[PDB]
Amino acid sequence: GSSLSPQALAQPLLLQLFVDTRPLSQHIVQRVKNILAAVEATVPISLQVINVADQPQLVEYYRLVVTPALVKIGPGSRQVLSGIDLTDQLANQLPQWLVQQEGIF
């Protein structure tokens, strides 16, 4: 079938985190990594950190003015988690991500 392969595998979940090199971010990072790595699943997530001090231009693009902060780009809809509540929002947002349910009402 496909490239002779029977399926285009889903693209790993694109997850990122904006930090200011502050321990808290590295702190929350562990929490983020720990939680994400806690859901494993057949679809692993890719955690990439963005140094706001290195590129504050994209931060403003996402109106992202608070740090630390986390932002999911996909697959699926985009979301912005910030306010040291990333772990609270993430844990709550994660399920919604996997539940990628017709976010419909």
Method: NMR
* 27 in Cβ contact with 73 (< 8 Å): no
CATH of domain 12-100: 3.40.30.10
What sign results for the dihedral spanned by CA atoms 89, 77, 38, 27? Answer: negative
Q: Are 50 and 17 in contact, with CB atoms under 8 Å apart?
A: yes
CB count in 10 Å sphere of residue 62: 16
The type of residue at 16 is Q
- Token digits for 25? 């971010």
d(CA 59, CA 82): 12
Q: Tell the burial category of 31 from Cβ atoms under 10 Å away from its Cβ (0-12, 13-18, 19+).
A: middle
Q: Considering only CA atoms, which of 39, 33, 48 is closest in space to residue 98?
A: 39
**Residues 81 and 69 sit within 8 Å (Cβ to Cβ):** yes
